[PDB]
C-alpha cells in the first residue's frame, strides 16, 4: 500500500 | 537478457498466448479484457480495476464535498488506446529498471518461483490447484483455458493513487497468511507519482512543504512487489497487527495506526517498530505454516488434472519453500533454511534497500505525510530511463537528484493536487 491514508 | 523479451504495443493483434482477451475469477461477470503476459507467471492488464472488488466498479468521483484528504479521481484515466499503450510501456520499463539491479533480480526471481500452493483439494491424498489463482484465457478457437499465474499489474480503481495488492480469498483459508500464497493483483500506475520533502522535519509534518522532490515510480512499484512477495509466500502480517504510532505528534492526534506489514515492507528504521518479541512470534507462526505445507505435500499421493505431474509439482513447492527431502522422498522444513528464506523475503527485499540500489532520493520513513500528486510520462527516453530513472546521466539532471527535483526538472511534472494543509 503506497501510503497510510495521509 | 531483459526481463520482458517483447516490446509489446497495445494494438498488437491477440494471439491467445501472451496477448489475449481474458477474464479473472472474481466470482462475477465481466467482459473479456485485453491482457499481456510480459514474463513467465506475470501479466499486465491496462485497465482500471473494476474487477477484483464488486463494490469498487464505479470510477465516478463522489461529490467534491465527500472527498478525503489524500486521494485523486479521474474517471477518464486509462480509457483510451494510447493511454493503455503508454501504460503497458511504462510498466514494462519499470520492471526492467527493477530487474537491472541485483536486488530487483533477486526479488523478481523469488516472485516467479512463488507459485501459489495447490491447496484446493479436500482430499489429503490428492494435490489440487485453487481456481482463483488462475485466469481464463480466450484461445484462438474461442474457448477458454485456465492458466495459473503469480502476478497481475492492473490499473487503479476509482481512487487513482491508492496503489496496493489485491487477491482473491478462500472460504476457509487465509491464503496470504497461511504459507499458501495467492495470485496478486497490484493496482498501480506509472503515469503519476508523488512528491515528498527533502527535510525530515518537513516531510513528517502535515502542514509543511509542497512536494519538491518526486518519488521514482520504480521504488513505488518495488514496494508493491515486496508486498506481493510476502503474499505469494503466504507470510503477510495480518493487517490487524498495527503500530499505534506514538513517535509523531500529528499521527497521534489523528490516532493513525500503521500495519506491521507496511513497516516491514519499508524496512530501515521503520522495521524496528516491530519489537523482538513480536518478530519472533511471526517467524515462528510462519515456520509452522511451512510445516503444515510439508505435511500436506507428504499426504498427497496423486495429482488432480493433466497440466503437470505430481513429482513436478512437489519439486515446484520444494523449491519455492526450500524444503528438505529425505530418502523416502518425504518433505520437512529445516529451521535454518526457513529462517534464511523468511529473512530474505522480509528484510532483504525492502523499500529502503531498493532506494540504495537505484541511487535515488526517497522518503526516509513510511511515517510521513503526502505532499502532492504529479502527472508524469516515463515512456520517452528523454524523460526517464531504465538505468537512471529521471536523473539522466551526462545532463544537468544527473547530479543531486536534479531529475527528481520537480522545480529544476519542471517539464517532467504537472502537479494535479496538493495535499499539504488538507489533513
Ligand atoms: Zn504498502
CSV table of N, CA, C and O and ligand atoms in Angstrom, one decimal, chain A residues 1-2, chain B residues 223-224 227 262 265 366, ligand 1:
chain,number,residue,atom,x,y,z
A,1,UNK,N,0.9,-1.2,0.0
A,1,UNK,CA,0.0,0.0,0.0
A,1,UNK,C,0.9,1.2,0.0
A,1,UNK,O,1.7,1.4,0.9
A,2,UNK,N,0.8,2.0,-1.0
A,2,UNK,CA,1.6,3.2,-1.2
A,2,UNK,C,1.7,4.1,0.1
A,2,UNK,O,2.9,4.5,0.4
B,223,UNK,N,7.9,-1.4,-4.0
B,223,UNK,CA,7.2,-1.5,-2.7
B,223,UNK,C,6.1,-2.5,-2.8
B,223,UNK,O,5.9,-3.4,-2.0
B,224,UNK,N,5.2,-2.4,-3.9
B,224,UNK,CA,4.1,-3.3,-4.0
B,224,UNK,C,4.6,-4.7,-4.4
B,224,UNK,O,4.0,-5.7,-3.9
B,227,UNK,N,5.3,-6.4,-1.2
B,227,UNK,CA,4.1,-7.0,-0.6
B,227,UNK,C,3.7,-8.2,-1.3
B,227,UNK,O,3.3,-9.2,-0.6
B,262,UNK,N,3.3,-3.0,6.6
B,262,UNK,CA,3.9,-1.8,5.9
B,262,UNK,C,5.2,-1.4,6.4
B,262,UNK,O,6.1,-1.1,5.7
B,265,UNK,N,7.8,-3.9,5.1
B,265,UNK,CA,8.0,-3.6,3.7
B,265,UNK,C,8.9,-2.4,3.5
B,265,UNK,O,9.7,-2.4,2.6
B,366,UNK,N,8.1,5.6,6.3
B,366,UNK,CA,6.7,5.4,5.8
B,366,UNK,C,5.8,6.3,6.7
B,366,UNK,O,4.7,6.6,6.3
C,1,LIG,ZN1,2.5,-0.8,1.3
